[PDB]
DNA sequence: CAAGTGTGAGGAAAAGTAGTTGGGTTTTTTTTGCAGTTGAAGACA
């Protein structure tokens, strides 16, 4: 449902999860990794989750001989991807996007589909109203911000958005049309973008994701 | 190509503390009336 929610896809990577994901076994939480240096034994199991999730994709998309999955049909999904406002949850990840971190939403901190500044600036309002409350910086300090805060009154000086599944819905049908090197590139351009998402919610490590992807790459091919 | 021991530093923050200054008393070490009087210069025998 994140996105391209290809209702098949669910059992396609629940399947390969099935095949070697930890011999058809529902991955259990790693380890009490005991030793202080935290290698990357890599067993975190959604991590892993995530790699099948990826690699089902493109193996997938990328042996689709009998083209069940058309040409302009992977380049829709990502498309109609195109970010958009969220229900809640887009504009949530828009707020973790903003820790600044390895620029992959800095840009659309730039960006930032105007609105989605708006619904932005009102969870500001809202959830940084605690932000705090100075205490010893002579009562005179604190009337002065007052006052400021005063002369700043501001807070004013389709209920529109939509939900969740409205969206999902939505986008579920924006592909509804369903029924060489450029795809390869397509492909490729897709699960860049997943791994854009799926890595954003988590420590990236815009290697180690990609190490994760390595190792059970290698873990697969001993069919 | 690959997994596995050993292990040093980089990093964060509130409060404190630094440096520089200034402030700061406290401190501490013009005549305008009266009547008289003395001393005075000058004169004299």
Not at 213 to 223: D, M, T, W
Request: hydrophobic letters at 35%; one cysteine or more; aromatic letters at 12%.
């Amino acid at each position: 449902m994140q996105c391209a929610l290809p209702p098949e896809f669910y059992f396609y990577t629940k399947q390969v999860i099935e095949f070697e994901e930890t011999d058809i076994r529902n991955l259990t939480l790693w380890e009490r990794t005991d030793e202080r240096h935290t290698g990357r034994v890599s067993n975190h199991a959604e991590l892993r989750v995530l790699s099948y999730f990826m690699l089902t994709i493109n193996w997938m998309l990328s042996f689709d001989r009998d083209r069940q999955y058309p040409l302009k049909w992977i380049l829709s999904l990502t498309e109609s991807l195109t970010q958009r406002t969220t229900t809640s949850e887009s504009i949530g990840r828009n707020i973790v996007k903003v820790v600044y971190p390895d620029k992959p939403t800095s840009s659309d901190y730039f960006q930032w589909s105007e609105e989605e500044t708006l619904e932005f600036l009102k969870w500001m309002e809202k959830q940084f109203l605690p932000t705090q409350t100075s205490m010893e910086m002579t009562i005179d300090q604190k009337i002065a911000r007052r006052k400021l805060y005063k002369i700043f009154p501001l807070d004013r000086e389709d209920t529109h958005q939509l939900t969740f599944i409205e969206d999902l819905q939505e986008r579920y049908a924006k592909q509804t049309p369903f029924f060489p090197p450029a795809r390869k590139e397509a492909i490729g351009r897709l699960l860049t973008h997943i791994a854009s998402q799926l890595l954003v919610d988590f420590a990236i490590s815009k290697e180690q994701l990609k190490d994760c992807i390595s190792r059970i790459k290698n873990a697969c091919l001993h069919r």
